[model samples]
Target chain A: NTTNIDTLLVATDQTERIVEPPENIQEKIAFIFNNLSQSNMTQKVEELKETVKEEFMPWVSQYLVMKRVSIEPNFHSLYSNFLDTLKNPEFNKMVLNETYRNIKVLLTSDKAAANFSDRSLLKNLGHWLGMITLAKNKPILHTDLDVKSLLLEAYVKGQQELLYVVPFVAKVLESSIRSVVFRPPNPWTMAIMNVLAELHQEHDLKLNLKFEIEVLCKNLALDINELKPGNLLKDK
Target chain B: RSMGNEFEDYCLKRELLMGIFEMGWEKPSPIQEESIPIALSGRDILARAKNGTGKSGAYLIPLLERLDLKKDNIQAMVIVPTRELALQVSQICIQVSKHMGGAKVMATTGGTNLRDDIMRLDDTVHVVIATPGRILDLIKKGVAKVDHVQMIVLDEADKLLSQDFVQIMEDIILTLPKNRQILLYSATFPLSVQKFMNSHLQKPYEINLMEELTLKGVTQYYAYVTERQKVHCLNTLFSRLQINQSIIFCNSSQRVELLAKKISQLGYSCFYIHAKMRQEHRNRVFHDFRNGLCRNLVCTDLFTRGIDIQAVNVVINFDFPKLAETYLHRIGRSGRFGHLGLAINLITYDDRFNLKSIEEQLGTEIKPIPSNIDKSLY
Candidate 1:
């Protein structure tokens, strides 16, 4: 077939053409990760957040609410390719160790939480973290870390932190529990129980409470005996 | 008596069960009984079940059960081949999600205002039932995103993998999350579809309930008539037979209109629909026909696939279908969900060989039309 998509676009209407980001978004993403790894990253975090907020926020917000088809050129490639770069071992470690902590600071900052929660920076970051878990097929956090304490920190900060920071934790937590359920020792059992416990108290602020926890437990292959308050609170 | 397994056997969400119960589905059909468990386990599935065998419920039940109602993004996407099928699928989705709060379902296709569809996407719509072409257009416009979509359904995979739609289907799948579950359902899987599945689906669980093309609950008959006498024969059948609702098929749009006009002139209420008509006109006709507002619907092959009307009990082929598959789909319109149905064909001298070939192909006999239409076995 000699016909190109532009022919169909013209026949359908020129405005219907699938437009990619002007520059290569994959390369731009790589540049962003490289910059984050190389600099006095605290300042870089502020600048990169502004960059995402300005250029990419519109796409992310619109894309989420909009109806999309896969045949057309879309930001899906951009998002997937962006996460694909983060799958790099060296870059993945850099993000978990330094970048994620700084981003968490911004996410948990009272002023940033209160003012910037609705901003795309947090939404994009949450999505980015979630995508990383999806890509890596594992949890971002160490098994021994207290996930409930981290959730508590996010909850105390503000609505912005609660909304943006909690999803990433939920995503990683789900991924972590999923990995354990499919394998042996059920490694994240303690961490999963603690987070479920914290959410039991404060979930009205962060979740639908009934469905989210139910789905979480179901995915983890954990039962009431495993997650019950008495059993979870009992120390070894 | 109930048909197959109860809906509760699958361990669906309580709220989803509320909606299923409200829809009056007491038991899952055989296809549903087989497909739902594997689908719930988050496995890719390639299913083959004849029309009216509860295939829609097979996938929709699992899709509804597995959805994370808390997530605001579109979690499941269903792509069908035509606008009518898209609307039909979307209706089932709406009915299924009635009690599941905050899980929004929307249908978008060609022939509507694209601008309005873009506006609807600005809200937190969860499930989108769409046709391939229009969805591709919307996605290209930067309004639709599939990254968070966990499950994708190609509901009539054979038609979608056919020459016209296969390329667009490939384009659409490339944009979805690779780890997401895929379900491909159709009554027939040709070689092209088999190849497509090999390329796309990974170790898919295959569910096949349709061992043959003929529907079990539908009785078939053919009446000899000349080209000039088909109208008279149809009028005689309509006057004598007991029909709750009947769909009459013609081979061409012009023939559909002429036949419908002649039937109306004979004092029977009838409506005609074809793909060439205005979309709004088609939608209104489809809506009215499903509600039992009209006793007779005359159309081309447009009504052949993806339309599930439970009241339809008789199918009259005013013009013999050109292909065996088309004949199966034409009669498949009736006999929905194990309901008893009759398919009577109006044939001429030239159609005898075609009818014989179709009968041989289907592994079922098409008997001569009995003298007593109402007393005939179905």
Candidate 2:
């Protein structure tokens, strides 16, 4: 599937092709996508684009050459659309799905890592859903201070009120969720539920309270039966 | 057990009682009887009793009775936990010192215009009661001179000596006279008090009125809920009780603000206290709460000692305490002088052990109030 150098390079329909490195790979790659340094997803984008272009370009160009037609490729429109989709969740998910196999390869192999503990991971996912709700213009009923106070009160209960800590934390979490105004997408909510469930399992009771957590997730339209692969959450 | 008549037959002549009455003395209470003699003897003394047990008067009167009128330049200094306590001590000292023309009492604490307090100190004052921080502020300013002060009082000594206020007290004690009378008063002091006694007092005498007195008249109740639901419970409980006066306990400074915000929004009159709050704000809140303008007062452990409000009929533990002794201190805010009062604890299932410990500490069992009261319906 690698690009062959002897094949014609220019084809009207074949755009953004990659070939065997001429020399000096890093500089050559940087020249392709200039001024995208600030973008956090640059490395992933480069790999996906390089793999598609390298494997398909040469074979596709041979047909245009046989037709004896002047061939010109336009990469400008494609790159613009790629950037636009990367910036939007719908388009971003589509692009990631398009490069699913390649993306999975990078995510699971040496490049992907996991650092956060299960409990920390759940709270983080909860915070992420909160952020997404805010991004989508949802109403947050409680202020940050309100959440902080609730946490402190729960902390007090944990220290003093034997019957107060768990119920208090649960209430604070519920109120925090309500403050986000709108519900996050099913997958993100699923991610949070999975994280909390993992934390519950780690704590280990005969039947973890998370078994009952399904009723609460039902209110958010989250599926309780399915759990995402644990490794799907990777280290930065 | 019916409480004993500790305030009987003061063999002192009518003229002497008149002399005391002239200084705004009313009938003596139980604490005044037990403490007045010990305090007058000038032996280092520690008295234990709940709030409104007339503890302030218990200490202030004997100290006033023994004041040196002719030579006045801060002879007595009282250290309290808050500016409100400072104000209460000053008010009581002034009332007790009335008609004793030679005695001049002044209060120096945070939140007042320093210049004004400085100007007030221009005269030779006999007694000065203040919170450690503000008093230290004045000491640093070179205006509050306590070099000649003889007797030093740690009112609400337990709170003044609390882990949080230890450094502040250490800094303050260094500024006072080396050769001085030390009087430490508190309802209860864990082992730390003994540590303080070893270092601070010379052969200190301990008086434990707390264990001997039965608080049989006070009824205790609790409700268990989540942290966020505390405010709703507070509002609901207050409304249901329709208490003319009561106190609400918050665990920390931040929750004090949140509870105050929620209570205020619900159109209930309330105020709060914390270490960082402005002194004037603390003073204003205490003044209003004492006057009955504010029915619900939210505070931390800071208000449990030395601050005076005699008519409090109910005590609400909005947040439970880590220690059983602290629970006693909070509930002790009411039920003073055997007047029947109530202590309500809102506990969640998780906090049941803490509630149990508090009951165990009191050596009594608490009855649970089930569907007798509906919070949301109220």
Candidate 3:
């Protein structure tokens, strides 16, 4: 009777550790893995590198790989596999992780800092992702993870009439997200969004954000919902 | 009612008509009405009109019409006394000759690089606007040749024939072809300029507007103050008066710097320009003042001639002008193109004689400000 009671209490304590994810659990996982493997993501990451004007050191990427575990608990294998492809581990860890922490600390620790306020940090992230995409042996779309680079590769192949120039309009939209989030004054934000909308109309492009991307957009309060094809034509 | 008849009556080039219309000339002014036809008839003419009465246009219209646009040499030359006037004349030449396609008007003045001027002259320039010293220097250097020059205009002839410029002007005239037409224009012909014209002109046609010398649109006033209290007086007026834009003239470059700094220290937006400054700096100040970046501009007499910024509603003689003619040119910066303007002379006790002489020359009494005057008049 005493052993059965101890076992029941232990089982109850373990149940709290196995809590269910909020809505869009599968969608969030797929978003992270799929988007990271997409060619656009790699290209954007490369642009981020250029914007930040920094190198993507091997250890910093490794540190981000370690940090990825904390955010996504159920996807350790996906991240681990992503990390194993980069074979060089002989690079010094202290200086590399220190630089990585300097950039990551601003994003994770500074709760009072305004959204995307530190353009320096955002630029560092750009540089980091850009370096990762460029340094990969093969294309990110054909990586060992088997995840598809649907949007980017599809746009490249001219599958959709909306994206004739492959990634230009999308790149503008993604890059401008940092501007809208960090830079204040409503008119500038409106102007950037207006340009983004005009580009969409000019190319007949439709933007479809997955669940995780939508949540991030909601968190930043960036409003691209009004960027419809026929909407800006009348306002002009 | 018959204002356009002044230009329409002449058998002018169609290109010249388009240029005039494009430059927004509704009708020819008095000087333009009198001088344009005679000069168009290939006659050497001497013309005199007051500042702000469109004398530059009077010669520019004919010069634009007379220029051989297809020629690849310097066909026309206009010489002024100072770099600022040279720039202003060249700007007008460019605008008046706009419809004459491929015609190039270049300003070659001192203070700019000689090499650049040589390079610009290497092109097929239709006209050359220059100051006396640099043009002579260029001619001596073989960078500029005037053998092909058919017409020569000496603007502000009185000033050009003054003590400092007379020798250089004569030297320049000696180099020109004897058969070329010589057109002289000035507001007031001093004895020296008259002597030069008498020796130079070959039965030259002459026109004088001395009866219309003093501008009627400008309201004149003087503020009597000590040298020490001038800044305080200017501050008081600036704070009290509703000024759109104003130009304050100082006699020296040093005074311009001091007053501009003191005015800026007093929390007013101000800029200054003088002959000693770099050409680029001077150009910046000129354009900035023209664009209304500040309400007050402090400068020397380098700015007293040929600048036409219509928004300038007031002109202040921060230092009393030495000459009556200089006083007119200083005040003429305001009330441009028939616009209303006000001129206030900040006078010290020593400046009374100069002020009185100017009043006599202008043939108008400048009212002294009453001690208990209303500020609303400003």
Chain A vs. true chain A, TM-score per model, equals 0.45, 0.24, 0.23
Tens digits of per-residue lDDT for model 3, B1-378: 123454555667766765675565646766577787788777889877654325678888888888777778888889888777787778777877775788898888785788898988887887889889999998888888888888899988888899999999999888888988889988788899789988988888888744333457677889888898888777655533334467889999999999998876655557789989887788778777776455568888887432466546568889999898888777653222444357788999999999999899888778886554324223
Docking class of 3: incorrect
What DockQ do the predictions score, one after another?
Answer: 0.01, 0.00, 0.01
RMSD of each: 26.4, 30.2, 24.2
* Candidate 3, superposed: residue stretches over 4 Å from native: A1-236, B1-6, B49-54, B132-145, B159-177, B187-195, B210-215, B218-241, B248-263, B272-287, B299-307, B316-336, B343-378
Please list the residue runs of candidate 1 whose C-alpha ends up more than 4 Å from where it truly belongs after superposition.
A1-236, B1-4, B49-54, B133-142, B158-174, B186-200, B209-211, B215-236, B249-255, B274-284, B300-302, B305-307, B317-336, B345-378
| TM-score ranking, best first | 1, 3, 2
Report RMSD for candidate 1: 26.4
* Residue A201 of model 2, lDDT score: 40
What is the CA-based DockQ of model 2?
0.00
Task: Report the TM-score of chain B alone for all candidates.
Answer: 0.77, 0.64, 0.72
> Could you tell me every candidate's TM-score relative to the true structure?
0.52, 0.45, 0.49
**What residue pairs are clashing in model 3?**
A45-A129, A45-A130, A46-A130, A48-A126, A48-A127, A49-A126, A49-A127, A52-A123
Q: What residue pairs clash in candidate 1, if any at all?
A: A65-B121, A66-B143, A67-B144, A68-B144, A69-B139
| Residue B305, candidate 2: C-alpha displacement in angstroms | 5.9
